[PDB]
Design a protein around this ligand. Structure first.
Ligand SMILES: NC(=O)c1ccc[n+]([C@@H]2O[C@H](COP(=O)([O-])OP(=O)(O)OC[C@H]3O[C@@H](n4cnc5c(N)ncnc54)[C@H](OP(=O)(O)O)[C@@H]3O)[C@@H](O)[C@H]2O)c1
Length: 293
């Protein structure tokens, strides 16, 4: 299948590497256009894939069977909208990122729009990406109008195992957002690894109560307790890790907060729910960003 990968960072390079290993015809698509993109990936078994692939070829884009998007959340929608008039109108666009709120920015996309999450882990080490862990990628329809693109799950399963189609992708994204709304800003603010959060059960529950209330109003069934339990399982499995938001903070990079607690606050406002803890986290992180930027 012919694929354009938008965003040639850790995840994009993972997918590019994996797609080439199965013989799919690919290109990259970069922010700062160049004719080629550098893929340097170390697989879980130590094998090395170092390759220069086509990038930013608009004719290639115009005849792609899939636009795979692996940008950070705040990068996604402007970059997609700018390619959308080139991409065939029948060609699916698959978004894989953390956070939510990009789909709301992409309501007028005429292409089929698919949302994805993944538990694979890929980490930048200089100009090398390392595939740290294998995992599971779920994809589904981004919007109410988006139809059955399960065939893509079947293809991508053979590229980067495991991939599954989920019609209820949105509910899954909301649960992952709950976890993200706890772990990312608290670790960012406290400058601590994820496991330190277990010494704050009350604050964790409070955030979980706010998010559960938004989730219920959105039509997905969950409870504060269930969200809390899922948070603790993620903290337990990542206790020693530095969160992606804390990494951003420490590297003086823009964070995904407008698509994590920020999104949660936009949906809270639209259902008139008060979310004072989430608000504090969002504002605290925005202030930390303004200390650089
Ligand atoms: N990496 C993982 O293990 C992992 C796992 C699960 C989910 N995710 C999620 O996947 C998303 C991407 O993560 P990542 O780790 O791959 O991020 P990353 O390494 O920062 O990759 C993003 C790439 O897209 C580029 N970019 C920004 N704006 C662009 C534009 N307009 N056009 C083209 N390229 C543009 C970046 O280049 P510049 O930095 O030069 O702008 C970068 O190379 C995030 O939401 C993350 O939370 C990541």
């Amino acid at each position: 299948m012919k694929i354009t990968v938008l965003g040639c960072g850790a995840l994009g390079q993972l997918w590019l590497t994996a797609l080439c290993k199965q013989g799919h015809e690919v290109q990259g698509w970069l922010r700062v256009p160049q004719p080629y993109c550098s893929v340097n990936l170390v697989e879980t078994d130590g094998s090395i894939f170092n390759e220069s692939l086509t990038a930013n070829d608009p004719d290639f884009l115009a005849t792609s069977d899939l636009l795979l998007v692996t940008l950070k959340a705040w990068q996604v929608s402007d970059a997609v909208k700018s390619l959308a008039s080139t991409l065939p109108v029948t060609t699916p666009i698959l978004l894989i990122h953390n956070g939510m709120g990009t789909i709301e920015e992409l309501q007028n996309i005429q292409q089929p729009l698919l949302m994805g999450t993944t538990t694979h882990a890929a980490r930048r080490d200089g100009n090398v990406i390392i595939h740290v862990a294998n995992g599971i990628t779920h994809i589904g329809p981004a919007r109410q109008q988006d139809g059955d693109y399960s065939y893509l799950a079947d293809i991508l399963q053979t590229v980067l195992p495991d991939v599954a189609w989920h019609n209820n992708i949105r509910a899954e994204l909301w649960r992952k957002l709950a976890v993200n709304c706890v772990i990312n800003p608290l670790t960012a603010i406290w400058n601590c690894p994820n496991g330190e959060l277990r010494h704050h059960p009350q604050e964790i529950m409070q955030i979980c109560e706010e998010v559960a209330a938004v989730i219920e109003r959105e039509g997905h069934h969950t409870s504060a307790e269930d969200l809390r339990d899922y948070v603790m399982q993620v903290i337990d499995a990542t206790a020693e890790n530095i969160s992606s938001m804390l990494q951003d903070i420490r590297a003086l990079r823009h964070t995904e907060i407008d698509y994590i607690n920020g999104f949660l606050l936009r949906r809270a406002r639209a259902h008139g729910i008060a979310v004072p803890e989430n608000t504090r986290l969002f504002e605290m992180v925005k202030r930390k960003e303004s200390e650089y930027e």
